[PDB]
Structure 1
Amino acid sequence: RLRYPPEMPGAEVKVYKKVDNVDLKLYIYKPADWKPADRRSAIVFFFGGGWQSGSPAQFRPQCEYFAGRGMVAMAADYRVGSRHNVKVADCVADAKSAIRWVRQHAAELGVDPQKIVASGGSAGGHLAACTVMVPDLEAPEEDHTISSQANAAILFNPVLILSREGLKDHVPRQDWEERLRERLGTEPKAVSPYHHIRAGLPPMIIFHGTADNTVPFETIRLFAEAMKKAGNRCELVPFEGAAHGFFNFGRGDNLAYQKTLELADEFLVEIGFLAPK
């Protein structure tokens, strides 16, 4: 199972953020025949764990796959509640710092600063969505003239609704909702991707199980329908009968794992970030 600190063999380690004497690392998997002058697409994975735990090792298999396909793939560490005195808003700031750091260092990374993909699972899928559509929550001392907004997103059963304001439906109480409002660090709408749907957003694809008992599928369905209405490319792929975490390497018989990769691959080829196989 996953361990923290993680082991990322063959990954180049770079500190992307220094905050509260914590060195937050990116674990970078470069493709074959990589050179700094390249202008490759990049993907940054944010692990899940309810903004409380988790490990960058979670998306290590996906990093190796997309590095094999020609991307600069990386897994970001970020601060979480069980290890650091942080709230959800602090995690968002770390995720944005990671995107900004990749863009800022795009020339030394061999990366096209306009082809940076944010990706993640559950809380990490929420963070990835925040880097494409949730305003502000930036580290105060960073260069805000360097955008922290990713150019696409690939979300694995993310959390996308963190407030109940304006919603015309009932959303069931969840264990992880354990008055997380005390650990949000902002008014809930300010960390709720659903509440910042608007035209002109980067394209994304979302994988979600219809039997997810942690994040109800309907919240993601409602999100995708509202994003389509605003003109955005937001493809929701239901996994029928799948539970929370279905996509992970090792779950089931890696069928959903392989399936999400081939769908994510096709999505990246569609939007011109990846060459066909």
Structure 2
Amino acid sequence: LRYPPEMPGAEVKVYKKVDNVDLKLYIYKPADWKPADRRSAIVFFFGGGWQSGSPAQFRPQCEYFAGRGMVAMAADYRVGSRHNVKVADCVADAKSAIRWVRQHAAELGVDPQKIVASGGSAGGHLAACTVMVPDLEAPEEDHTISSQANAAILFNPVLILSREGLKEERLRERLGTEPKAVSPYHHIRAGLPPMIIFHGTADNTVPFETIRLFAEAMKKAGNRCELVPFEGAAHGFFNFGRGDNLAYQKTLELADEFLVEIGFLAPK
């Protein structure tokens, strides 16, 4: 991956101006697109530990889902190696992206109620923050337009950020807030949007146990929260180019059937 990314064929829209930085959405429209459609949308957040990464990471997935009838985009967001930000600022950026898409749903040809948030690792964390973590919103935006996504597709996300529980200072200094405030696990509750999670059993960056604990506690609250374990796979397994795209093709396959499952996508 490179940054700045190369995104051929994508339409470029600035969704947020902050610190004189113009944060961009790379939008991939389907074939039979008109401003009057009400298609589902998916917004991808790249990974890279809230410090690096590139919107090009999920460009392959955008092209796939746009070919399947969605308005697919990859969001840029501020990161530590480029901008003076902490994790809490990254969350505000991800929320701005969802709010912007909903605010512009009419011109995007999008159903404001079928907006999916998605991401890998740190960007999987952000996507989950847009469905279940409160506040951390850009203070000058219209809070009467909801920043909450309607579904989430998570690729080995980080879901537990605070040790407030059973079983360090470097982390608290890159968070920009109390650890619980940026931790999806400590905001599990009933009535949350549906979601599907792809995680590796041998993940040594984000332990699989932290995700299975999240998913179980999410089911006892009545939410749709499906784990798809990938046996022996490690952090990053899903990415286009890993092995020979067996995980990439299967994650796309199980994500497609999940969007059909909740009604955001039409059968083939």
Question: For the residues of structure 2 that align with 1:212 and 1:269, how far apart are their CA atoms?
Answer: 28
The CA deviation string for residues 56-83 of structure 1, in whole angstroms up to 9 with x for no partner, is: 0000000000000000000000000000
SS at match of 1:180: helix
Deviation string for 1:182-215 (max 9, x for gaps)? 0100000000000000000000000000000000
- Give the SS at the match of 1:227: helix
3-state DSSP class of the match of 1:214? Answer: coil
In structure 2, distance between residues paired with 1:237 and 1:194: 18
| Post-superposition offset of 1:248 | 0.1
- Give the alignment's TM-score, normalised by structure 1: 0.96
Q: Which runs of 5+ in 2 are unaligned?
A: none
Question: Where does the alignment leave 5 or more consecutive residues of structure 1 unmatched?
Answer: 169-176
Query: Helix, strand or coil for the counterpart of 1:102?
Result: helix
The offset of 1:178, in angstroms, is 7.0
Q: Deviations over 1:1-20 (max 9, x none)?
A: x0000000000000000000
Percent of aligned pairs with the same amino acid: 100
Secondary structure, aligned partner of 2:169: coil
Q: Quote the offset at 1:167 in angstroms.
A: 3.3
Residues 26-84 of structure 1, C-alpha deviation per residue, up to 9 Å, x if partnerless? 00000001000000000000000000000000000000000000000000000000000
Residues of 2 paired with 1:120 and 1:62: CA distance?
11
Q: Distance in 2 between matches of 1:203 and 1:250?
A: 28
Displacement of 1:180: 1.6
- Cα distance in structure 2, aligned partners of 1:258 and 1:130: 26
Shift of the alpha carbon at 1:179? 1.4
CA offsets 1:233-267 (integer angstroms, 9 cap, x no match): 00010000001000000001100000000000000
**Partners of 1:236 and 1:47 in 2: CA distance:** 20
Q: How many residues align?
A: 268
Runs ≥4 residues deviating over 6 A: none
1:165: which partner in 2? 164
Q: Following TM superposition, by how much is the alpha carbon of 1:224 offset from its aligned partner in structure 2, in angstroms?
A: 0.1
In 1: Cα distance, 2:169 partner to 2:5 partner: 27
| Distance in structure 1 (CA, Å) of the matches to 2:117 and 2:82 | 23
* Distance in 2 of aligned mates of 1:259 and 1:196: 29
Q: Distance in 2 between matches of 1:119 and 1:196?
A: 18
Shift of 1:108: 0.1
TM-score by length of 2: 0.99
